[PDB]
C-alpha cells in the first residue's frame, strides 16, 4: 500500500496525456482520473493510520541508486515518518475532491483530459516530494510542482496575461531555487550526506539556515516574494484550490519544519511581517479570488512564525498546515461555484442575494469561513489558537512584536473574510446573469472537505490539542473578541475618508511596480551594453578594406 | 485541387499542370518589409557603434568595472582557500617565485 | 464558452523601433510590455516617487519596533523560566543555536550557552 | 488632467466624457450598486449648477479642475464585465484561425529532403 | 587500426557510386556513418572499467599519431557517432556527404589521439571543410565563415611554436614522456590556453560563434554545437592538465574570471537576442563556461563532472537545433516576429521544444540536472563564492528561455504544421539519450 | 477592423520612444542590485576583515 499513495496519481496523469487518451475521451479520461485518486488516497490513509497512531516508520528502495560521483551520493529512495504521513494524507485527501470538482468544473473546456492529467501529474510530483528521504529527490519534486505549476497558471495560453503569470511565477521560484541549492551544497559538504535522518544540526554556519530559508520563501510566498502568487489566479478555479491547499505553497513550509536548521530571528520577522502585510492587502481587494490568495499568504505567515518559535511551534506549524489545506480548498471550490453562478464575474460588487447559488455552497463559504476566522471549537480554532499562545510565551524579545502583529491580523482576517460573505449573500443583487450550479460532483467534492473540517475537531493532528499552556482569561480569550471585532466592523461596512492610505493599501504596497524597475529594466539594459557595446563594440574586430 | 500521386503511390511533379502543387515551399511567410529592416540592421549593429560619451562611460564602470571585480573575486577565492587549506602563499602569475603545486608526500 | 470573439492586432507599417524587443505581441489586440509596469501609465496613475516617498517613512515604521524590543528588553521581562529538564535531556537541548532554552536566565551556564550561540558565517581553520 | 485624446475633443464630448468617466469611477470606488445610486444622483446635481455658465474662462477653470480630480481619483482596480478588454474573460478559448494541411509531405520528392551544399 | 582502414574505404566509396542511382546513394551514405556507431558501442563493451586508464593503444612508429582509449574519449566518441547519421539525415547532396564523412574521420581520430603534434595535425585539417560548409554559395555567409575559421586559425598559431618548444626540449610530443619530463611550462601553457580558450567559446575570443554556428545549416548547427565546442574540453582533460599542471595552477584567477565573465556576460546578451537560431547559440557560451572553471577546479571529481556536463549539452543542444531548423526549413524564416501559436499547430513539435528547454534549462530528470550539480560540487570545493556566482544567476537563464518558449508557442495560431516521420526521427536519438541519462545514467 | 466598434480601434498609439535609461538611474540600480542579490561576498569580506584585524591584535599586543 505504501508505494501505491505516490506512484498511482503519476500513472493517472501518464495515461491523461499520453495517446491512450485519444481512446478514451472526454469522458473515459474523468473516469481514470477519479479512480486513480481514490485509490491514492485510501492507501494514504492507510499509512496515516499505520505511522502516525502505530509509530512504525517504512523506507523504501524503490529504483535503485540516481547518481553516485564521489562522495555525493544520491539514490531512489523514499522514507515514510510522521511528517511524510501527515502530508501524504493532507495532499491527496484534498486532490481527490479537487478531481471530482474538476470533471465537471472543465466540463466545456475543449481539451479537458489535458488538464485533468496536469492536475494529477503536479499531485505526484508534490507526493514525491514529501516521500523522499534525502534532498536530490525532493529537488525533483520541487522542481516537478514549480513546471505543473506554470503548465496550470498559463492553461488558456491564448491570453497573454496568463502565459505572463506563468513566466512570472518560474522566474521567482527560480531565485530561491537558486539560493536553495547553494544551501544543499552547504549541508552535503558539512554534512557528508544527503538522507534527512543523518542531517542533524546544532550550530552550522548561518548560509545554511540563510540560504534554505530564502528557498522556502520563495515557494511559501513571503515577503518579497508573494509577488507571483496573487497573478497566479490567471489559472483557472481548481488550479487555484490546489495551488493554495496542498501543493506548492506548503512546500517551504514542510521544508523548514523538517530539517530544523534555521536561525529563528529571521524566520519570525519574515514572517510576521508576512502575515500583517497580506492582511491588509487583502481587506483592499475586490476580486474574490485575491482576496481568497492573499489569506492563504498571511496564514502561510502564521505556520512561519510557529516554526520559528521551537519544536513544538514546528508541531504546531504542521498541524496549522494540515487543518489549513481543507478549509482553503473548501474556500476556493465555494468561490468557483460562485462566480460560475454569476457569470463568470469575480468583482464582489456585482453579487447578492441567496439565488445564484446552491445551499450547498453557501454552507461551504459559511463552514470554511467559520473555521479561518479561528470560531471557537472548529477546525482552525485549535491551531491558530495554539501557535498564538505559543508565541505569548516566547523568551525571545523579538517574539512580542510577532505576537502584537498577529494578533493585528487576525482581525483583519475576520473583517475581509466576513466582508466576503456579506458581500456575496447578504446584500442586495447587483449582478446580472443568475444560473446556480447543482451538479452531483462539486457539491460531493465540497461535503468531504466539510468531513475533513469535521474530522480535524474529532481526531486532532498532533497531541497539542488539550494540552493547556497556562495562560490568563485575558490573554487566552482576546482572539475571540478580534473576531467579533471583525465581524462587526464587517457587517456594518464602514469606511475611512483617508484615500491615500487606500490607494495605497489597494494597489498593494507597489512591489510589483517597484520590481518592474529595480531589477528588471536594469536587466534589460545590461543586455543591451554587452550585447551593443562588448560583442558589436569594444571585442569587434573589423575587416581590411584593399 | 491538385494530384500529386497517383492511385497506387507513385508521387508526380505536375511541372506542367495547371493546379498549384503543395510542396515544401506552401507554408513559407510572406515577408513583412519593415520587419525584414529591422532584423537586417540588428544584424548589422555594429556599424552603429561610437566612441561618444555615454559609450565610453557604460563600457568602463560595466564592462571594465565587472571584469575588475570578477578578477578581485578570484583571487579572494584563491588566497582563502589556500589559507584553509594550510598552504603557504602560493605563485600566480607575476608574483615572484614561491610555492605552487602541493606535495602528495606531504602532510599541511 | 469557447470560441468568443477576440480582437486581433495589427501588422507593423512602419519603420521599427531599434529595441522593439520590449513590447509582446501575441497576434491578439491589445499586446503588453515584456514586464509589465515597465513603461506606460502604472494603475491609478501612481509613479515610483510616491511609493519611494510613502515607503520612506512606512519602512522605518515596521522596522521601529523590532529595533527597540531587540535592543532595550532582554530575558527577565518573562514572568517565568523556560521549560525545565534533567541534567541529561537539557545538555543536549540547548546544544541547538536554534533553541528557546537560552533564555534561561537562571541556568548556571547562562552566559557560556550565550556565547556559543553568536551566529558565524565563514567557518574558521 | 485629460489625457492627449481628451484634449483634442469638442467641448460638448469633452463634458459628456467627464461626466460618464465620473460615474464609471463612482461605480468603481463603491462597495455595491444600490451605494452608487445616490451619488450618481449627487453627481448629477453637480453638473446640473454649472449648466448656465457662459465665461469661457470660468467653464475652463472648472473643467480643468474636475479632470485633475478624475485623474486623482482613477481606481487602481476598475470594474470591467468578463468578456472584454481588461476582463478577466477575455481572449481565453478563441477559434481556431483556418490553417493548411500538407498531405503525405515525406513521399513527395524522396531521397532529395536535406539541405543544399 | 585495420578496422578503422576499412571502415575510412568503404566510407570513401560513396564517390564511385553513380549519381543517377539515387536510392543507393542515400542508403551508402547512411550505413558509412552507421557502421561506427556500432564498432564504438564494441569498444565500450571491450573496455575494462577497472583496468588501466588507458587501454586498446596503438602507436604508428615515428610518424607520431599515437591513440588510446579513456573515459572521457570513450564517452565523446560515443556521442559522435550517434550524432552523424542524423547529419546524414539532414543533407541532400554528396558533397555534403563527403564532407561530413571527411569530418567524421578527423573528429574521431582526433578525439583518441595521444601526441600533441597529432592532435594539431588531425584536429584543423577540418578548417577548409568548415570554411565550405558556412560558406556555401546561395545560403550561407562567407563573414561567418571568414570569422571562424580566422580565429581558429590564429589560436593554432599561437600553440604552435610551443608545441615543437616542448618537442625540442624533451624529444618527443608523446603525452606519456611529455607528463614526465621536466619543461618550461609558462610558454607551453600560453599556447595550449589559446588555441583551447578559441575552441571553447571563452571571451574574448568568443565572437565567431554566433555568426559560424547560425549560418551553417542545420546539419554544421549539431556537429559544431555538439561536438567541436568539446574538443577544447578533452585539449584541456587530455593534454593541458597532465603536461603543465603548475601552469594550470598559477593561471587560475585569470581563468576563474574568464569563465565568470564570459557565463555572466553572454547570459545577458542571450535575453536581447530576436533570432531563435542566435538564442539557441548564445546559450552554449555560458555551459561551456561552467564546463572549463569544473576542468580547472580540479577538486572532487572534476573530469567526470565535466565530461558529464559536455555529454548533456552534446545531448541537448542539437535537439534545440533541430527544432529551429525544422521551423526554417518549412517557414524559410528564423525570425521571433513571423512565429505565435505553435502549440495549436505543430503539438508535436512544441512539446519536443518544451522538453529541451526545461534539459537546457538544467530541470530534473534530464541530465544537465545531474551535470550541473555535480559541476557545481566541484567548483564549490575550491570556495563557497566561486560556486555562489552560478547559483544566484539560474533566473537569468530561464528568463530568455522560457521567454523564447511563450513567444513562439502561445498566442495567435500561425506557422508550419506538425512534425514528420523524418523529423521525429532526427530528434528521437536524443530523446531517448536524455531520458536514460537523466534518470538511470550508471550502474 | 470588423471588432473596432466592440473592442475600440487601432488609432490610440503606444507612448514610449524605447530609449535606453538614463546613466546615472541605470547606475545606482545596478549598484543596489549587487548589494542585495550578492550580499554574502560582502559578508564574508567582512569576515576576512574582522578576523585579520584580530590577528592584528595579537601580534601587537604580543610582542611588547
Ligand atoms: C485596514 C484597511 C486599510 C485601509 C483603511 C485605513 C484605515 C486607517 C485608519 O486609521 O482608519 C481609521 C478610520 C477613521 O478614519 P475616518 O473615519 O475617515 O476619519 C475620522 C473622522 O473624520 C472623524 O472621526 P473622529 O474625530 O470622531 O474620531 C475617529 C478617529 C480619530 O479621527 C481623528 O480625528 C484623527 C486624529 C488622529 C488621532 C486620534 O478615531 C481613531 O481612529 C482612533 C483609533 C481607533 O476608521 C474607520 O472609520 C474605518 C474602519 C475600518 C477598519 C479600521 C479599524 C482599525 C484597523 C487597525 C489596523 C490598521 C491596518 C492598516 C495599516 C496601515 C497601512
Ligand atoms: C596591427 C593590427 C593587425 C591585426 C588586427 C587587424 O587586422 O585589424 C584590422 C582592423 C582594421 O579595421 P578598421 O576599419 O581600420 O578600423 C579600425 C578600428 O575599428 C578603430 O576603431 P576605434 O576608433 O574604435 O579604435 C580605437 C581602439 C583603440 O585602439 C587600441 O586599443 C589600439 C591598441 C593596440 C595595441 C595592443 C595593446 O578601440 C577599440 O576599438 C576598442 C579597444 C581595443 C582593445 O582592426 C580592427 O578590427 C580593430 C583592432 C582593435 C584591436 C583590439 C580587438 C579587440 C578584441
Ligand atoms: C572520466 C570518466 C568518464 C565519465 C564521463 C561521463 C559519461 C556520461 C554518462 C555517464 C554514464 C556513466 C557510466 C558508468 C558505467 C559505464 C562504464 C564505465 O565504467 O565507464 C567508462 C566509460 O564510460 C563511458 O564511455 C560512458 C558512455 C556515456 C556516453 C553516452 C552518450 C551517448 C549516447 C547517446 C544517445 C544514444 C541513444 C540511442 C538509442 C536510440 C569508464 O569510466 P570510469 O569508470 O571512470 O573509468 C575507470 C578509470 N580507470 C580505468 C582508470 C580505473
Ligand atoms: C575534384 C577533383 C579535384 C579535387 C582536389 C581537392 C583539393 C582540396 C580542395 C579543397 C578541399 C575540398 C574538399 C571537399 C571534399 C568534399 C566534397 O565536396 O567532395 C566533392 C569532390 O571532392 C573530391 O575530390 C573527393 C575526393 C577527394 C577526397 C577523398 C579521397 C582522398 C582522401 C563532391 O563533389 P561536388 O562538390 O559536387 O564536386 C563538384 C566540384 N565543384 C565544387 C568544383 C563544383
Ligand atoms: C475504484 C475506482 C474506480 C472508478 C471510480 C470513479 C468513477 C465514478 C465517477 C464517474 C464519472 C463522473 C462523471 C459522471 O458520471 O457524471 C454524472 C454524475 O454522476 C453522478 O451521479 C456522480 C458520480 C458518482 C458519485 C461520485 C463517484 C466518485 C468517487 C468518489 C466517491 C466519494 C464519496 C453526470 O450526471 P448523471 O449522469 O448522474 O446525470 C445525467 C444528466 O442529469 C442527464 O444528462
Ligand atoms: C592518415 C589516415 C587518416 C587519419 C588517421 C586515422 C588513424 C586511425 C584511427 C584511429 C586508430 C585507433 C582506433 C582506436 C583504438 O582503440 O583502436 C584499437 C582498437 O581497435 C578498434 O576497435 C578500432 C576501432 C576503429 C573505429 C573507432 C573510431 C576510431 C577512429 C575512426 C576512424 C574511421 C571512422 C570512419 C567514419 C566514416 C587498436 O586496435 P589494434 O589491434 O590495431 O591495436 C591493438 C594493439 O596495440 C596492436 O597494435
Ligand atoms: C517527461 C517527464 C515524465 C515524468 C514521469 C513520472 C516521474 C518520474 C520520476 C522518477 C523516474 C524514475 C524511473 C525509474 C525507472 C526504473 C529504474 C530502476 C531500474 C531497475 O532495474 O530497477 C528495478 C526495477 O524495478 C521496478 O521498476 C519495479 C518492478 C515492477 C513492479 C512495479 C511496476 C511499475 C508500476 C508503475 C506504475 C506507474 C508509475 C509511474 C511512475 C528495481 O530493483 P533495483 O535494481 O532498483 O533494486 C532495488 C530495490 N529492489
Ligand atoms: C462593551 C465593550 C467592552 C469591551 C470588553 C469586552 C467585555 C468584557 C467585560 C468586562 O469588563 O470583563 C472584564 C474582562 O477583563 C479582563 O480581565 C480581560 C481583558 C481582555 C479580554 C478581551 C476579550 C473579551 C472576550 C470577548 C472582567 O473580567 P471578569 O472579571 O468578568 O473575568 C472573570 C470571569 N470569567
Ligand atoms: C544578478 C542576478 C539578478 C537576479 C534578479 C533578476 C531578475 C530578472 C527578471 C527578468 C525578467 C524578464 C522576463 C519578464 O519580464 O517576465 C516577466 C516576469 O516578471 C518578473 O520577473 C517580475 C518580478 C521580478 C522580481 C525579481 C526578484 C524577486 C525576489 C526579490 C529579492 C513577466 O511577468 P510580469 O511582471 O509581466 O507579470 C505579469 C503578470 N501580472
Ligand atoms: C562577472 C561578475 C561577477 C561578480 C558579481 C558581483 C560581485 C561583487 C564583488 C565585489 C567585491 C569583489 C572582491 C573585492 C574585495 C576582496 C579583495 O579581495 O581582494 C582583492 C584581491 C585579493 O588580494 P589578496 O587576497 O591580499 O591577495 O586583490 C588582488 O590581488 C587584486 C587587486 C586588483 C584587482 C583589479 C585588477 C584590475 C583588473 C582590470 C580588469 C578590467 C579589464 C577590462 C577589459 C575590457
Same mark, same amino acid.
Given at each position: ?546 | 485541387?491538385?494530384?500529386?500521386? &497517383? ?6 511533379? @505536375?511541372? /506542367?499542370?495547371? =493546379? ?35 559609450? &565610453? ?6 564592462? @571594465?568595472? /565587472?571584469?575588475? =571585480? ?39 | ?125 | ?117 | ?443 | ?64
Amino acid at each position: 500500500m505504501f508505494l501505491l499513495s505516490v506512484f498511482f496519481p503519476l500513472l493517472g496523469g501518464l495515461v491523461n496525456t499520453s495517446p491512450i487518451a485519444r481512446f478514451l475521451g472526454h469522458r473515459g479520461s474523468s473516469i481514470i482520473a477519479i479512480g486513480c485518486m481514490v485509490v491514492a488516497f485510501i492507501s494514504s490513509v492507510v499509512i496515516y493510520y499505520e505511522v502516525v497512531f502505530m509509530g512504525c516508520a517504512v523506507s523504501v528502495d524503490v529504483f535503485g541508486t540516481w547518481f553516485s560521483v564521489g562522495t555525493f551520493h544520491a539514490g531512489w529512495t523514499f522514507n515514510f515518518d510522521l511528517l511524510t504521513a501527515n502530508m501524504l494524507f493532507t495532499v491527496t485527501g484534498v486532490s481527490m475532491a479537487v478531481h471530482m470538482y474538476a470533471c465537471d468544473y472543465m466540463r466545456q473546456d475543449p481539451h479537458l483530459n489535458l488538464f485533468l492529467g496536469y492536475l494529477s501529474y503536479f499531485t505526484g510530483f508534490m507526493c514525491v516530494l514529501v516521500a523522499a528521504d534525502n534532498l536530490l529527490v525532493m529537488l525533483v519534486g520541487w522542481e516537478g510542482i514549480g513546471v505543473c505549476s506554470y503548465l496550470l497558471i498559463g492553461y488558456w495560453s491564448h491570453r497573454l496575461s496568463a502565459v505572463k503569470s506563468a513566466q512570472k511565477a518560474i522566474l521567482v521560484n527560480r531565485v530561491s531555487d537558486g539560493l536553495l541549492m547553494w544551501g544543499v551544497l552547504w549541508v552535503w559538504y558539512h554534512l557528508g550526506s544527503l538522507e534527512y535522518d543523518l542531517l542533524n544540526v546544532y550550530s552550522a554556519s548561518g548560509f545554511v539556515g540563510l540560504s534554505i530559508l530564502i528557498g522556502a520563501m520563495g515557494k511559501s510566498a513571503q515577503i518579497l516574494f508573494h509577488v507571483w502568487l496573487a497573478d497566479a489566479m490567471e489559472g483557472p478555479t481548481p488550479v487555484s484550490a490546489l495551488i493554495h491547499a496542498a501543493t506548492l505553497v506548503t512546500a517551504g513550509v514542510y521544508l523548514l519544519v523538517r530539517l530544523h536548521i534555521h536561525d529563528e530571528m529571521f524566520v519570525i520577522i519574515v514572517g510576521s511581517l508576512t502575515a500583517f502585510m497580506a492582511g491588509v492587502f487583502g481587506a483592499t481587494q475586490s476580486d474574490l479570488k485575491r482576496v481568497i490568495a492573499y489569506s492563504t499568504c498571511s496564514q502561510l505567515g502564521y505556520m512561519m512564525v510557529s516554526l520559528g518559535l521551537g519544536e513544538t511551534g514546528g508541531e504546531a506549524s504542521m498541524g496549522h498546515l494540515m487543518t489549513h489545506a481543507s478549509f482553503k480548498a473548501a474556500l476556493f471550490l465555494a468561490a468557483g461555484m460562485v462566480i460560475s453562478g454569476n457569470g463568470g464575474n469575480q468583482h464582489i460588487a456585482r453579487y447578492g442575494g441567496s439565488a445564484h447559488s446552491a445551499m450547498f455552497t453557501m454552507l461551504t463559504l459559511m463552514v470554511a469561513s467559520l473555521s479561518l476566522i479561528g470560531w471557537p471549537e472548529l477546525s482552525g480554532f485549535y491551531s491558530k489558537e495554539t501557535i498564538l499562545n505559543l508565541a505569548a510565551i516566547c523568551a525571545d524579545p523579538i517574539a512580542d512584536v510577532a505576537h502584537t502583529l498577529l494578533l493585528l491580523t487576525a482581525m483583519l482576517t475576520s473583517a475581509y473574510t466576513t466582508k466576503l460573505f456579506y458581500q456575496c449573500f447578504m446584500v442586495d443583487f447587483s449582478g446580472s446573469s443568475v444560473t446556480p450550479v447543482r451538479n452531483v460532483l462539486p457539491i460531493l467534492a465540497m461535503a468531504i472537505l466539510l468531513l475533513d473540517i469535521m474530522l480535524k475537531v474529532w481526531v486532532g493532528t498532533n497531541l497539542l490539542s488539550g494540552m493547556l499552556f497556562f495562560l490568563p482569561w485575558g490573554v487566552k480569550t482576546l482572539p475571540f473578541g478580534l473576531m467579533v471585532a471583525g465581524i462587526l466592523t464587517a457587517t456594518a461596512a464602514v469606511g475611512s475618508e483617508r484615500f491615500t492610505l487606500i490607494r495605497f493599501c489597494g494597489s498593494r504596497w507597489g512591489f510589483d511596480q517597484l520590481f518592474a524597475r529595480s531589477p528588471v529594466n536594469p536587466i534589460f539594459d545590461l543586455g543591451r551594453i554587452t550585447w551593443a557595446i562588448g560583442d558589436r563594440g569594444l571585442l569587434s574586430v573589423g575587416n581590411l578594406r584593399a | 485541387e491538385a494530384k500529386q500521386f &497517383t492511385p497506387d503511390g507513385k508521387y508526380m511533379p @505536375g511541372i /506542367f499542370s495547371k =493546379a498549384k502543387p503543395l510542396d515544401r515551399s506552401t507554408q513559407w511567410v510572406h515577408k513583412n518589409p519593415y520587419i525584414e529592416a529591422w532584423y537586417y540592421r540588428r544584424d548589422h549593429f555594429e556599424n552603429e557603434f561610437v566612441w561618444n560619451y555615454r559609450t &565610453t562611460i557604460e563600457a568602463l564602470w560595466f564592462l @571594465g568595472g /565587472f571584469t575588475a =571585480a570578477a578578477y578581485a573575486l578570484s583571487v579572494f577565492a584563491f588566497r582563502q582557500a589556500d589559507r584553509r587549506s594550510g598552504y603557504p602563499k602560493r605563485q600566480i602569475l607575476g608574483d615572484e617565485p614561491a610555492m605552487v603545486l602541493p606535495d602528495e608526500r606531504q602532510f599541511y | 464558452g469557447a470560441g468568443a470573439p477576440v480582437k486581433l492586432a495589427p501588422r507593423p507599417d512602419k519603420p521599427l523601433p531599434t529595441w522593439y524587443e520590449l513590447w509582446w505581441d501575441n497576434g491578439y489586440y491589445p499586446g503588453q510590455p515584456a514586464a509589465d509596469f515597465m513603461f506606460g501609465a502604472w494603475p491609478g496613475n501612481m509613479t515610483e516617487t510616491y511609493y519611494l516617498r510613502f515607503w520612506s517613512v512606512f519602512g522605518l515604521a515596521l522596522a521601529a519596533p523590532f529595533y527597540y524590543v531587540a535592543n532595550f528588553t532582554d530575558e527577565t521581562r518573562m514572568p517565568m523560566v523556560p521549560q525545565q529538564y534533567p541534567a541529561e535531556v537539557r545538555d543536549v537541548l540547548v546544544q541547538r543555536r536554534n533553541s528557546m532554552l537560552k533564555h534561561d536566565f537562571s541556568a548556571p551556564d547562562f552566559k557560556e550557552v550565550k556565547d556559543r550561540a553568536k551566529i558565524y558565517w565563514t567557518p574558521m581553520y | 488632467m485629460a489625457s492627449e485624446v481628451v484634449l483634442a475633443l469638442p467641448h460638448k464630448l469633452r463634458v459628456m466624457r467627464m461626466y460618464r468617466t465620473g460615474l464609471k469611477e463612482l461605480i468603481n470606488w463603491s462597495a455595491n450598486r444600490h451605494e452608487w445610486y445616490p451619488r450618481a444622483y449627487a453627481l448629477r446635481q453637480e453638473f446640473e449648477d454649472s449648466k448656465a455658465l457662459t465665461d469661457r474662462e470660468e467653464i475652463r477653470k472648472k473643467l480643468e479642475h474636475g479632470e485633475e480630480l478624475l485623474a486623482r481619483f482613477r481606481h487602481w482596480e476598475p470594474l470591467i464585465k468578463p468578456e472584454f478588454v481588461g476582463g478577466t474573460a477575455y481572449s481565453i478559448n478563441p477559434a481556431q484561425p483556418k490553417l493548411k494541411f500538407i498531405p503525405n509531405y515525406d513521399a513527395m520528392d524522396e531521397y532529395k529532403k536535406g539541405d543544399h551544399l | 587500426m585495420f578496422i578503422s582502414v576499412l571502415l575510412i574505404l568503404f566510407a570513401l566509396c560513396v564517390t564511385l557510386i553513380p549519381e543517377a542511382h539515387y536510392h543507393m546513394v542515400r542508403v551508402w551514405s547512411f550505413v558509412a556513418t552507421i557502421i561506427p556507431m556500432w564498432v564504438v558501442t564494441w569498444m565500450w563493451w571491450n573496455f575494462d572499467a577497472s583496468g588501466h586508464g588507458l587501454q586498446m593503444l596503438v602507436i604508428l612508429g615515428r610518424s607520431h599519431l599515437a591513440f588510446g582509449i579513456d573515459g572521457v574519449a570513450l564517452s565523446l566518441m560515443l556521442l559522435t557517432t550517434v550524432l552523424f547519421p542524423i547529419c546524414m539525415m539532414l543533407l541532400r547532396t554528396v558533397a555534403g556527404f563527403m564532407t561530413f564523412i571527411l569530418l567524421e574521420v578527423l573528429v574521431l581520430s582526433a578525439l583518441c589521439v595521444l601526441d600533441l603534434l597529432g592532435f594539431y595535425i588531425l584536429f584543423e585539417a577540418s578548417l577548409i571543410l568548415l570554411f565550405l560548409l558556412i560558406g556555401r554559395a546561395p545560403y550561407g555567409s562567407l563573414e561567418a565563415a571568414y570569422k571562424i575559421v580566422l580565429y581558429t586559425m590564429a589560436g593554432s598559431l599561437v600553440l604552435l611554436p610551443t608545441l615543437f618548444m616542448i618537442y625540442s626540449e624533451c624529444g618527443t610530443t608523446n603525452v606519456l614522456y611529455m607528463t614526465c619530463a621536466y619543461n618550461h611550462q609558462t610558454v607551453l601553457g600560453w599556447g595550449l590556453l589559446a588555441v583551447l580558450a578559441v575552441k571553447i567559446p571563452l571571451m574574448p575570443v568568443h565572437l565567431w560563434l554566433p555568426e559560424a554556428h547560425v549560418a551553417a545549416p542545420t546539419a554544421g548547427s549539431v556537429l559544431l554545437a555538439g561536438v567541436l565546442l568539446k574538443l577544447g574540453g578533452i585539449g584541456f582533460l587530455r593534454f593541458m592538465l597532465p603536461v603543465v599542471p603548475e601552469f594550470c595552477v598559477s593561471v587560475f584567477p585569470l581563468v576563474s574570471t574568464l569563465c565568470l565573465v564570459s557565463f555572466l556576460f553572454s547570459t545577458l546578451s542571450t535575453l536581447r537576442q530576436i533570432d531563435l537560431k542566435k538564442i539557441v547559440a548564445y546559450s552554449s557560451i555560458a555551459h561551456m563556461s561552467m564546463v572549463t572553471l569544473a576542468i580547472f577546479s580540479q577538486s572532487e571529481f572534476s573530469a567526470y563532472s565535466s565530461s558529464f556536463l559536455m555529454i548533456a549539452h552534446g545531448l541537448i543542444s542539437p535537439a534545440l537545433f533541430l527544432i529551429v531548423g525544422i521551423l526554417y526549413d518549412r517557414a524559410h524564416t528564423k525570425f521571433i516576429l513571423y512565429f505565435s501559436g505553435l502549440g495549436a499547430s505543430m503539438p508535436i513539435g512544441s512539446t519536443l521544444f518544451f522538453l529541451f528547454t526545461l534539459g537546457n534549462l538544467a530541470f530534473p530528470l534530464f541530465p544537465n540536472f545531474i551535470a550541473e550539480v555535480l559541476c557545481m560540487v566541484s567548483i564549490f570545493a575550491v570556495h563557497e563564492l566561486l560556486a555562489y556566482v552560478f547559483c544566484v544567476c539560474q533566473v537569468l537563464g530561464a528568463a530568455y528561455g522560457f521567454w523564447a518558449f511563450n513567444r513562439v508557442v502561445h498566442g495567435l495560431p500561425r506557422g508550419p504544421a506538425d512534425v514528420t516521420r523524418t523529423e521525429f526521427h532526427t530528434v528521437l536519438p536524443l530523446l531517448i539519450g536524455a531520458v536514460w541519462l537523466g534518470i538511470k545514467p550508471m550502474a | 477592423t470588423s471588432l473596432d466598434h466592440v473592442f475600440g480601434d487601432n488609432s490610440n498609439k503606444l507612448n514610449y520612444n524605447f530609449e535606453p535609461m538614463g546613466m546615472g538611474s541605470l547606475f545606482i540600480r545596478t549598484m543596489v542590485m549587487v548589494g542585495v542579490f550578492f550580499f554574502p561576498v560582502f559578508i564574508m569580506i567582512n569576515d576576512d576583515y574582522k578576523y585579520t584585524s584580530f590577528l592584528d591584535k595579537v601580534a601587537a599586543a604580543k610582542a611588547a
